[PDB]
Amino acid sequence: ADLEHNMHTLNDNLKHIEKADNATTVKDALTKMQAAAQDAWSATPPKLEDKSPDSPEMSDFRCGFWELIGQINAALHLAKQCKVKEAQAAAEQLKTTCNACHQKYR
Amino acid sequence: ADLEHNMHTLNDNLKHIEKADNATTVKDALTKMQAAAQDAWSATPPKLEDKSPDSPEMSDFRCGFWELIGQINAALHLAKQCKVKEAQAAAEQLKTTCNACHQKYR
Amino acid sequence: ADLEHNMHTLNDNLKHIEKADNATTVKDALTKMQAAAQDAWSATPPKLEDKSPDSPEMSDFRCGFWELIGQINAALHLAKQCKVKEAQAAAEQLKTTCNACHQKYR
Amino acid sequence: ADLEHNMHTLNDNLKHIEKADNATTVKDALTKMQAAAQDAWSATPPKLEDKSPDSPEMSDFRCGFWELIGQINAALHLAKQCKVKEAQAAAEQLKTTCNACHQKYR
Amino acid sequence: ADLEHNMHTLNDNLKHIEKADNATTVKDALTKMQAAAQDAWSATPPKLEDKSPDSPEMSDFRCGFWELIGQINAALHLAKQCKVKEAQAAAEQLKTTCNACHQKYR
Amino acid sequence: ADLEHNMHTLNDNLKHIEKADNATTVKDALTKMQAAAQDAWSATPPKLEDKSPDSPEMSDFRCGFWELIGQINAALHLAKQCKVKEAQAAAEQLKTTCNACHQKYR
Amino acid sequence: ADLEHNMHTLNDNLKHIEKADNATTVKDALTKMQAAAQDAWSATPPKLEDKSPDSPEMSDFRCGFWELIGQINAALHLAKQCKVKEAQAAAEQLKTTCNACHQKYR
Amino acid sequence: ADLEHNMHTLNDNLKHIEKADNATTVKDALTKMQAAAQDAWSATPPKLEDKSPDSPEMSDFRCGFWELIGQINAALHLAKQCKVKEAQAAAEQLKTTCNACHQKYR
Amino acid sequence: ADLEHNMHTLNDNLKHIEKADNATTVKDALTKMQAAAQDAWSATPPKLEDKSPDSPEMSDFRCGFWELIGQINAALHLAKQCKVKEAQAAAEQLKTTCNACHQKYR
Amino acid sequence: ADLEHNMHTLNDNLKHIEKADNATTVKDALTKMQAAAQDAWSATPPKLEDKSPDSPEMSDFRCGFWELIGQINAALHLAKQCKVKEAQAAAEQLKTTCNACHQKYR
Amino acid sequence: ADLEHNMHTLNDNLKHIEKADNATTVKDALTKMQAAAQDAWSATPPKLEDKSPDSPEMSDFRCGFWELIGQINAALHLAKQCKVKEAQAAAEQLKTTCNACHQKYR
Amino acid sequence: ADLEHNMHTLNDNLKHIEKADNATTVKDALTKMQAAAQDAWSATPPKLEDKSPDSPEMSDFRCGFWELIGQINAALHLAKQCKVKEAQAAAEQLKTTCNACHQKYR
Ligand code: HEC
Ligand code: HEC
Ligand code: HEC
Ligand code: HEC
Ligand code: HEC
Ligand code: HEC
Ligand code: HEC
Ligand code: HEC
Ligand code: HEC
Ligand code: HEC
Ligand code: HEC
Ligand code: HEC
Ligand SMILES: [Fe+3]
Ligand SMILES: [Fe+3]
């Protein structure tokens, strides 16, 4: 998938996690987010099209997806423990990472 | 698995590699360690729970696991060539990476 | 596979990409390169055999493969969209990453 | 997935189909829509929650998804023949089926 | 399986759902029912053996199973959300569909 | 596959069923017919190209494939019971459905 | 799955074996009995709910199911040898093993 | 895998079951114990290395592990029934079987 | 498969193990013996064809094969530990178990 | 499948290749032909039923399928490169091999 | 497997086919022979060890196995049609091919 | 793959086999050669583009790949026996076949 739709997947599923009332819906939504974040790591955003592949901005862009992937995996562990409110709280914390990347590069 | 048990897997299997005679036992122990390290990369240790996900400490934490994961993979290559003594020597070298992370974050 | 043969896979398939006239062969070549680069990330090059695994040199070496893996995945996305000339141009741009590592560490 | 998110999948992927320039992305989008429509056939919409399951309203609701599923499969056949503009035109014609159900039951 | 035994599976597992405490047992019982209903859709009951395949009775027969299959799927969705009481209530509603078909064709 | 070749598959295999003298050849031929009928359900015949997707003719066209798929499944059950003459008789009865659709729409 | 329903599977499939007129229904019924018996082997019967898990009663219960499993497989063997009537006689013989455990723990 | 490490897996996972607060960690721990016990069943203990493989000692050792396997599965059954505290009590009960074999062969 | 030929597989592979000069042929031969013994366990020997399936004779026959299976696995264990000569000695030891059952039922 | 139906598969799919306007359908048709020709290599034609299996006639018959299989694989390579007209021309050249065998042995 | 044991498999299973009553036993025996013949095709017999790989003897050797492999496949077709006597007659015909090769190269 | 790259695969891997010091590297390299040789059998070399598909040159070309595939399979058997020097010697002998085809057709 392209970067735009990977963002649709992250956003759409993150909103279902907030609305959910059970661990299974949360785990399923987080699984879809994990695959979108894994795919997105390799993209180049439009604001960075002219930078070199080794620029600090592109290293910083990749670091943001590393952070996001790790936090999604940690939320998945909580959902697998049937700790639904804890997983939802971890999914909310994820938005700090979404926000930080958007501020600089979206 | 949670971080504690990933550390059980790392520590337990590293001891077997040191005492192993044949490459089949080193190979399976390394394979178990590889999976534990790939899982632990995504964790947040207790002492860093309140740091930001992009903090230099959490970045350094994840660097530790990249170094560990790469070193286990290199040791696994030697084990698949049936180079037991070389694989055990690569395993022994890993400990510097274990110790360095513990000193800072355990 | 060992580092040397991963470089064989990269070199051989990149030559085929330059000469291709259809998206299918570009895709197949890029997929092989992706797997070769994934594997090579964990290697330690000769010129670096006596540096520490956490050294700035080994960290930079892994950075080069991250950049390479990302660019290959982006080229693969172009090829899967049947944009043969554009994937070829992305493949040609890989050489800046190949040369930069080689100058430092080959 | 629930009815609401199946509609998300339909809406999101249909927008990507309109904007696509290659058969590959059209195919991938249609496949996701096919799975969403398959799943939604078994749902009961809000406006129909108090009708009998054998009611002419619920029978008509399922008829709409049968028609939708068939049209998506036909569009997918066009996309698999690499007829991008023709699959896009078949996708655009889906909207008559979307609107007709929505007018009655959304 | 023949139609008789599909009916065994439907009747037996519906009784378990009514008495079940946990969602795992409701989920597996519904899964068994779903497979039995999907199989029974293709059958011809004894009393309709000499009707034409397009007869209004055989069409009505297959409509009964479409209604049943959809209702089981909706109940299975609730069970996968761990909503035991709601799933059991959806299961209980199924019986109208069982009874309506039996009255006409058993 | 397209509608024409799905018809080749139905016709070719139905003739082998008549010639067969064992259950295995019959079951294999019926399995191929089932997949062709499943695929064909989504097509639009040339005589109906101008009708709307919800027209009664297109509903009637889909009903014919429903009937055919159900009868193929029933024949498959007999072949699986090693009831070869019974399965062949059921395959002959299938031609009433082929005929009825051809009369109106071929 | 729950012990009571595994018993249902054993009882019902024995009825079908007794009525069957072909090897493949007998084989399919014996296969389902075999799965049900292997799942039942891990259950605790209501009347042994307070014995300890290493009690002679729980070891004897599990042994009882292990012997049933061996006899089911031996009957399945005969059916694969195409000895339908011998397989049916063997299945009928199971009832002595069923009753033996029932006298003790049902 | 080597007998000593299978023992490690049994011991460590028992510690995690005792501390667990949710069914799924208990289930995951019991599943790993089950695999470790089935692999240990094929080992020869150091103190029986010179007995013959059909000796009463080796048959009793293998029987001992077969009984542990049955008790592990029975505990896993309870956990799948969502009886977390009962599954934990059952796991605690295993220690009598562990100690029984240890007295003889450890 | 038929009991007599499973015996062929046991006998022939024992001859190959005795002649082998490498672990992997020994492992491959022991694996085939293990499969043959597990398939033979479900057979009825000609001389027990009229005993009842719960007779002591049929339980003892099945028990006999269960013990052979355990000893084959224990030999396979040694071979995976790269103890080729010990695995060959263990395989040679099987003949006492072969002869024991033969005296009774061959 | 028998020889006759393999020839059906060859004939039917070769007609579709001639009429195709996209690489996808050519590829699918060639793949079916490949499997048909693979299967037919082992057949004995009627006109040769009384020759010896090592006869120059049967050897020549197999040579014809080797030549046919090779040409189909070469056509498939062209189709996988999206060279539709070139694969069609390779398919048309197959007919020299079809006719040459038919003249001798059909 | 080495050539000797492939010959064990051929000879052993051919004897079972001659004495078999049902098609299931002929079918599995033929399947075993087919795999043994496909493997033996690649071997070099002792008496030809010093001939060139393109020698007329090694070519004739491989022709023998092509004839054998084709004949086994034809016999397997008859067995899959449940034509036991015809399959056994095709198997018996194979022996000319066995004998012809042995006379020259055993 | 095309014939040129299949030759790269044969050549590249054959050189690694000579350098190897363990059976695993040799077996892995031989596995890649086997797949390349299987693919190459269907090609037409440039020097033979004008010959007919049944010409003696094209039969001779296919014979060369037959010989190569058989010898690769024999080398694989030795590598699987952990006979590393023997497998390497067999891989060297393979070059006679490479040479003979190149002399005539490259
Ligand atoms: C960088 C490391 C990012 C992270 C982490 C996340 N997003 Fe993002 N997002 C990023 C960019 C560069 C862009 C612009 C993409 C473009 O091609 O223009 C976006 C865009 C979005 C959007 C808008 C998509 C659209 O409809 O055009 C959304 C809704 C979005 N992003 C959501 C989102 C969420 C929820 C994230 C965390 C879970 C997240 N993004 C992370 C870069 C990055
Ligand atoms: C950071 C990058 C680490 C690396 C690399 C390794 N370990 Fe570790 N370990 C780390 C932390 C933060 C912790 C604390 C976990 C907690 O929740 O408190 C640990 C813990 C351990 C333990 C103790 C586990 C326990 O029972 O509490 C052990 C035995 C252990 N670690 C071993 C170990 C080994 C052998 C490593 C390299 C092979 C290794 N660790 C790497 C952080 C990190
Ligand atoms: C570091 C991040 C590298 C990147 C990116 C690429 N290569 Fe590389 N390459 C690297 C090293 C350290 C070495 C030396 C390995 C050794 O054993 O000394 C190489 C070597 C090569 C070779 C020579 C292989 C041989 O036969 O000896 C080639 C042909 C090669 N590299 C090609 C290549 C290409 C095409 C790359 C980009 C697509 C590329 N390399 C990236 C380190 C790194
Ligand atoms: C009946 C046969 C329908 C067909 C065909 C399509 N849709 Fe639908 N849609 C339907 C209902 C009953 C509803 C209401 C669901 C509810 O929970 O109230 C909807 C809703 C939507 C939405 C809104 C989703 C949301 O976020 O609330 C969208 C965006 C939507 N539908 C899009 C859509 C498209 C693109 C369709 C064709 C491709 C389509 N729908 C078909 C019923 C039916
Ligand atoms: C038509 C659309 C049906 C639906 C929906 C259900 N059943 Fe049914 N059932 C149907 C027929 C035509 C028959 C007769 C079968 C025969 O060959 O005579 C049955 C039979 C049963 C039985 C009796 C089975 C037996 O042992 O003979 C039972 C117990 C049964 N059906 C239960 C059942 C349940 C619980 C259903 C809904 C969940 C249900 N049936 C639906 C036709 C149809
Ligand atoms: C509608 C519900 C149909 C059913 C059921 C069957 N067929 Fe059909 N068939 C149908 C159409 C609309 C057409 C014309 C297709 C076109 O694109 O022109 C056909 C065509 C055939 C053909 C001719 C194919 C050709 O070579 O052009 C055959 C041989 C055929 N159909 C056979 C057939 C059989 C054997 C069926 C029952 C098993 C059957 N069809 C069902 C519509 C429908
Ligand atoms: C012990 C080793 C048993 C063997 C062998 C068989 N059964 Fe059983 N059965 C057993 C128990 C402990 C129970 C009680 C289950 C409970 O939850 O109370 C049963 C019960 C049954 C039932 C009744 C189920 C119900 O609806 O209440 C039936 C119909 C039954 N068992 C049948 C059955 C058959 C046919 C068996 C052999 C083929 C058989 N059982 C074996 C214990 C054991
Ligand atoms: C026989 C049937 C056994 C059962 C049941 C259990 N164990 Fe065991 N254990 C057994 C032996 C022969 C040995 C000696 C292994 C050796 O290589 O010397 C052991 C050893 C242990 C150990 C110590 C391992 C070590 O590090 O030296 C532990 C911690 C252990 N066993 C635990 C254990 C548990 C928790 C069990 C039940 C859950 C259990 N064992 C069962 C033989 C047998
Ligand atoms: C009982 C538990 C047995 C064990 C353990 C082994 N064998 Fe057996 N064997 C058994 C029976 C009942 C029979 C008679 C089979 C028949 O159909 O008549 C046999 C037979 C053999 C044969 C002869 C087969 C033949 O061609 O007639 C052989 C060569 C043989 N058995 C070998 C064998 C070996 C090597 C075993 C251990 C490794 C072994 N058997 C175990 C019963 C049992
Ligand atoms: C020998 C090497 C053959 C090659 C290459 C092809 N065919 Fe063939 N074909 C062959 C024989 C011996 C027969 C007779 C089979 C019989 O049972 O008598 C045939 C038959 C056909 C048929 C008629 C099938 C029927 O319905 O009776 C057709 C339509 C046919 N062959 C087509 C065909 C095509 C298109 C081929 C190349 C692509 C082809 N054959 C190759 C022997 C051989
Ligand atoms: C050449 C093309 C052969 C064909 C066809 C068959 N066999 Fe063979 N066989 C062949 C050789 C070169 C050898 C000698 C193997 C050695 O290393 O010495 C054999 C050997 C046998 C044996 C003896 C095996 C042993 O225990 O030493 C048997 C029992 C045997 N062959 C049987 C056999 C059968 C039944 C065949 C057709 C179905 C058959 N062989 C074909 C060469 C060839
Ligand atoms: C015919 C039966 C061949 C066999 C066996 C082998 N090769 Fe080959 N090779 C062959 C041809 C016709 C060609 C020319 C291909 C072309 O399209 O021009 C080749 C070419 C090579 C090359 C050069 C590839 C290149 O870079 O252009 C190499 C390195 C090569 N062949 C190696 C090789 C090896 C190592 C073989 C045995 C293991 C081998 N070939 C077999 C024809 C045939
Ligand atoms: Fe960094
Ligand atoms: Fe739960």
Ligand SMILES: [Fe+3]
């Ligand atoms: Fe209708």
Ligand SMILES: [Fe+3]
């Ligand atoms: Fe049969």
Ligand SMILES: [Fe+3]
């Ligand atoms: Fe016992």
Ligand SMILES: [Fe+3]
């Ligand atoms: Fe394409």
Ligand SMILES: [Fe+3]
């Ligand atoms: Fe030849």
Ligand SMILES: [Fe+3]
């Ligand atoms: Fe080894």
Ligand SMILES: [Zn+2]
């Ligand atoms: Zn993507």
Ligand SMILES: [Zn+2]
């Ligand atoms: Zn999107």
Ligand SMILES: [Zn+2]
């Ligand atoms: Zn984990």
Ligand SMILES: [Zn+2]
């Ligand atoms: Zn642990």
Ligand SMILES: [Zn+2]
């Ligand atoms: Zn590697």
Ligand SMILES: [Zn+2]
């Ligand atoms: Zn290489």
Ligand SMILES: [Zn+2]
């Ligand atoms: Zn859903």
Ligand SMILES: [Zn+2]
């Ligand atoms: Zn959604």
Ligand SMILES: [Zn+2]
């Ligand atoms: Zn059925």
Ligand SMILES: [Zn+2]
């Ligand atoms: Zn039943």
